[PDB]
Amino acid sequence: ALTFPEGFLWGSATASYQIEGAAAEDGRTPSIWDTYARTPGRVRNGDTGDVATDHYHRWREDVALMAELGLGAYRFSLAWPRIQPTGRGPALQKGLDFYRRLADELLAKGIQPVATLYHWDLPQELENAGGWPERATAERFAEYAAIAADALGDRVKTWTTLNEPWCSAFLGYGSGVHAPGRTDPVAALRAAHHLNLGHGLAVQALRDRLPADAQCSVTLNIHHVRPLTDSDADADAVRRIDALANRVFTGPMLQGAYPEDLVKDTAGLTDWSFVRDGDLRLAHQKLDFLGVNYYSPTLVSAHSPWPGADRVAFHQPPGETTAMGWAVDPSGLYELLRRLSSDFPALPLVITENGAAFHDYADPEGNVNDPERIAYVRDHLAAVHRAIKDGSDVRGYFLWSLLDNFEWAHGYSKRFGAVYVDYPTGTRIPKASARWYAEVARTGVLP
Ligand SMILES: [Hg+2]
Ligand SMILES: [Hg+2]
Ligand SMILES: [Hg+2]
Numbered sequence: 001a002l003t004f005p006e007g008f009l010w011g012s013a014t015a016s017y018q019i020e021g022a023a024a025e026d027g028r029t030p031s032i033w034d035t036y037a038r039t040p041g042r043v044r045n046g047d048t049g050d051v052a053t054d055h056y057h058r059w060r061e062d063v064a065l066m067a068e069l070g071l072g073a074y075r076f077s078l079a080w081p082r083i084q085p086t087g088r089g090p091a092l093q094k095g096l097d098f099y100r101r102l103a104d105e106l107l108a109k110g111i112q113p114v115a116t117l118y119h120w121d122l123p124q125e126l127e128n129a130g131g132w133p134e135r136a137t138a139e140r141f142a143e144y145a146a147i148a149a150d151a152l153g154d155r156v157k158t159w160t161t162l163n164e165p166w167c168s169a170f171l172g173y174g175s176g177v178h179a180p181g182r183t184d185p186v187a188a189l190r191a192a193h194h195l196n197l198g199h200g201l202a203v204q205a206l207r208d209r210l211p212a213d214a215q216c217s218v219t220l221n222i223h224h225v226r227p228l229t230d231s232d233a234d235a236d237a238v239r240r241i242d243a244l245a246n247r248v249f250t251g252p253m254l255q256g257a258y259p260e261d262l263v264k265d266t267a268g269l270t271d272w273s274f275v276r277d278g279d280l281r282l283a284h285q286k287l288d289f290l291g292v293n294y295y296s297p298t299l300v301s302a303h304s305p306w307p308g309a310d311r312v313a314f315h316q317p318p319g320e321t322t323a324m325g326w327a328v329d330p331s332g333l334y335e336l337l338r339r340l341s342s343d344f345p346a347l348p349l350v351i352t353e354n355g356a357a358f359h360d361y362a363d364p365e366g367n368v369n370d371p372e373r374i375a376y377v378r379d380h381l382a383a384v385h386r387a388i389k390d391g392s393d394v395r396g397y398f399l400w401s402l403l404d405n406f407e408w409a410h411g412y413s414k415r416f417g418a419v420y421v422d423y424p425t426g427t428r429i430p431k432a433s434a435r436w437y438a439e440v441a442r443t444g445v446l447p
Contacts, residue, residue, distance in 0.1 A: 001445050001446060001447050002381075002382060002385045002445070002446040003444060003445055003446075004385060004388070004444050004445075004446070005388060005395075007395070008394075008395065008396060008397070008444060009072055009073045009112070009350065009395060009396030009397070009398075010070075010071055010072050010073070010396070010397060010440065010441035010444075011071050011072060011073030011074055011075055011111075011112070011114070011396065011397070011398040011399070012066065012069075012071055012074060012075070012398060012399045012400075012401060012402035012418060013074075013075035013076070013352060013353055013398040013399065013400045013401055013402070014055070014075070014076050014077070014401050014402055014403060014405065015076075015077045015116070015119040015120070015121075015163070015405075016076070016077040016078065016079035016082075016119060016121055017031060017033050017034075017049045017052075017077075017079065017119070017120065017121045017406065018049065018052060018119075018401075018405040018406045018407070018408075019052050019053045019055040019401075019403055019405045019406070020049070020052055020053075020054075020055045020056045020079065021049065021050065021051040021052040021053065021054040021055060021056050021057070022051075022054070022056035022057065023048070023049060023050045023051075024050070025056065026082070026094045026095065026098070027082065027085055027092045027094050027095055028079065028081045028082045028085065028095065029081050029085040029086055029123060029124070029125070030081065030123075030124045031079070031080070031081045031120075031121035031122055031123055031124060031179075032120075032121070032122045032123075032124055032127045032131070032172075032179035032180045033049065033120060033121055033179045033408075034048065034049070034124065035124050035127075035179065035180070036178075036179035036180060036181055037049065037179075039181070042179075042181060042409065043408070043409050043410075043411050044409065044410050044411040044413050045411055045413070046411075047406065047411030047412050047413075048406075049406040051423075051426075052405055052406045053403050053404070053405055053421045053423075053426060053428075054426040055403070056098065058426060058428075059098070059101070059102050059105070060105060061428070062402070062403070062428070063102070063105045063106055063109055063111070064109070065402070065419060065428060065430070066106075066109065066111055066402065067109040067110075067111065068430075068438070069418070069430070069434055069437065069438040069441065070438050070441045070442040071111060071438075071441055072110075072111065072112060072441065073111060073112040073113075073114055073158075073396065073398070074106055074111050074112070074113055074114065074402070075114040075115075075116065075160075075352055075353075075398045076102070076113070076114070076115060076116070077115070077116040077117075077118070077119035077121075077163065078099055078115050078116070078117055078148055078152075079095070079121055080117070080118065080121055080122065080123055080144055081121055081123050082095030082096075082098065083095045083096055083099075083144065083147060083148060083151075084123070084143075084144050084147055085123065086123050086124075086125040086126075087122070087123035087125050087126035087137075087140050087144070088125070088126075088140055088143075091147040091150075091151065096148075096151045096152070099115070099152055100151070100152065100155065103115075103152060103155040103156050104155060107155060112157075112158065113155065113156050113157075113158070114156075114158040114159075114160065114352075114398075115148075115152065115156050115158070115159055115160065116159075116160040116161075116162075116163045116219060117141075117144065117145050117148055117159070117160065117161055117162070117202060118141065118161065118162045118163065118198075119163040120163070120167070120168055120172075120178070120179065120408075122137075122179075122180075126140055127180045131173070131180055131182070131191065132168065132169060132172070132173065132190070132191035132194050132195060133173060133182075133184075133186075133187040133188075133190040133191050133194070134190075134194070135194060135197075135274070135276075137194055137198065138194040138195075138197040138198035138201060139198075139201065141198035141201070141202060142198060142201030142202050142204070142205050143205075145161065145201075145202035145205045145206060146205040146208075146209055149205060149206050149209040149210050150209055153209060153210045153211065153214065154211070156214075157210075157211070157213065157214045157215060158214070158215045158217070159206055159210070159214065159215065159216050159217065160217050160218060160219045160291055160352070161198070161199045161202040161203060161206075161216070161217070161218050162195055162198070162199050162202075162218055162219065163219045163291075163293075163352075164219060164220065164221040164293055165192065165195035165196075165199070165218075165220070165249055166192075166220070166221055166223075166245055166246075166248075166249065166305075167221065168191065168195060169188050169189075169191035169192040169195055170188050170191075170192070170244075170305035170306070170307075171305050172188075172191065173187045173188040173190075173191045174187075174188035174303075174304060174305045174306075174307060175303055175304055175305040176303070177305075177409055178408060178409060183302065183303045184302075185269050185270075185302065185307030185308070186269055186270045186307075188305070188307055189248075189266065189269070189270055189272070189307060190274050192248050192249070193252075193272070193274060193275055193279070194274075195249075196248075196249060196252040196253060196279075196280075196283040197279050197282060197283050199218055199253060199283060199285075200252075200253070200282040200283035200284065200285050201282060203216050203218075203285035203286075203287070204282070204285060207285070207286075215288040215289060216285075216286075216287055216288055217287050217288060217289050217290060217291050217350070218249075218253055218287060218290065218291060219291035219292075219293055219352045219353070220246070220249055220250070220290065220291065220292060220293065221292075221293040221294070221295075221353070222245075222246050222292055222293070222294065222336055222340070223241065223242070223245035223246055223297075223298050224294070224297045224298065224332045224333075224335060224336040224339075225238045225241045225242045225245065225297070225298045225300060226238065226297055226298065226299055226300070226317070226332075227299075227300060227301065228299055228300065228301035228315055229301065231301070233301075234300070234301050237300045237301055237309075237311075237312045238300060239261065240261075240265055240306075240308070240309045240311075240312060241298060241300050241306065241309060241312060243259050243261055243262040243265065244262065244265075244306050244307070244308070244309060245298070245306075247259045247262060248262055250343075250344075252280055252283040252284060253283055253284065253285075253287075254284070254287070254290075254344060254347070255284065256280050256281055256283070256284030257280055258272070258275070258280070265308045265309065266307060266308040268308065269307055269308050287347065288348070289347065289348040289349065289350050289395065290340070290344065290347050290348070290349055290350070291350050291352035291353075292336070292337075292340065292349055292350065292351055292352060292353075293351075293352055293353035293354070293400075294332065294333050294336060294351065294353070294354055294380075295324075295326055295353075295354065295355070295356070296317060296326035296327045296328070296329060296332065297317045297327065297329050297331075297332035297336075298314065298317070299314065299315040299316070299317040300312055300313065300314055300315065301313055301315060317329055317332075322356040322357050322358060322372075322376070323356075323357035323358050323359050323414055323415070324356075324357050324410075324414060326356075328356070328376055328379070330379040330380050330382060330383035331383065333351075333354070333380050333383040333384065333387070334383040334384075334386050334387050337349065337383075337384065337387035337392045337394060338387060338390065338392060340392070341387070341391060341392040341393065347393075348393050348394075348395050349392065349393055349394045349395065350394065350395050350396040350397075350398075351384060351394065351396065351397040351398060352396075352398050353398060353400040354377070354380055354397065354398070354399065354400060355373070355376075355377065355399050355400035355401060355416050356372075356373055356376040356377070356416065357407070357414040357415055357416045358370055358372045358373055358415070359415070360373075360404070360415050360417075360420055360431060362420055362422065362429055366429065367429075367432075368420040368429050368430075368431040368432070369431070369432050370431045370432055370433045371432065373418075373431070373433040374432065374433045374436045374437075377399065377433065377437065378446060378447070381397065381440070381446050382446060384397060385446065399418055399437060400416055401416045401417050401418070402417060402418055402419055403417045403418075403419050403421050403428070404416065404417035404419070404420055404421045405417065405421070417431070418430070418431060418433050418434040418437055419431060419434055
């Protein structure tokens, strides 16, 4: 039985469009995912987040569920489309009211609210104007952040600017398998830069408008890249993918410069002239901790998410697989954490996302048994604890997710929740893993 450090944060995570529902209620306007999901062939079975888990109406019950599970923190995203419809103009108070009430309820329960400003639900109007490949979007994101800070700053002390910008830029504009569904390598690289810029401008605005004790951060899905063989070519491959998956963001955000090799690898695609003088300094803002998302490692040797790395080829990492068919490999998380500790020694780490999808089902007696999810989480928590033992500064872990929800292009076909959701009724059924995880969050001990 392993014991986690004094003060370790135990929470769960969700995203606005994935759980909220009420897509066309109280002033909210369509985001890129609303458009993308209603587009034939884009999302499995034509599923949309119109209703999702109906969290917008069941928010009270969900917070109470968090309390019963003894969670200390709740990571959620703010729907830009609700707070500032269209991505420009004045704030919509009714939109902000939903989060005021939510945050207030969390606090009343002794649960620390952690808000992510941007979790992919870009207002469609900003996409109509160019989306992330267009510079103005970054400036608009900063204004939105100031609006959010100004309204919720007194109740929410932990903030995250962006969640997994890699997926947003490369899957959204590179391979187009995510909203808005575009496919252009340069567009994807411009999007990456503008996400870097937006993040910076946002942290600047957060720093400026929030109390002096608030915590600002960014959530990155750090790809842990490994080579198929020892070949020297496979090592070059690892470098290319690491630069595209991680350093294109950690470079500017944490070091104030794009890695030279990345610039070199993409020289055939672009000259990065859209990186205006001073953009890198703006993207490089002081953070209180880095949010890390991890699920599985990467094994390597006009329409892809890796512009400039066509010479490379990916492989299925070894290990059992989840419903997503992603390899289960706790070691990937341990190595990943050590890498980060080595590269950014002074940067406290928080696992803002980790979990697994399995084909759960509610039996005739009303129970949902997910022993496989219990194993996955336990195994990854052990890797985390091990990383901590060896020196890594990890301060928290957020299980993805509290509720089964709209898993983007996969629709509702993938269940990641600690709590099962009967979609037609919206009924929540805590799974066996919820009961097990509750014990870990109450004792701080991992059996
Ligand atoms: Hg992704
Ligand atoms: Hg801050
Ligand atoms: Hg990826």
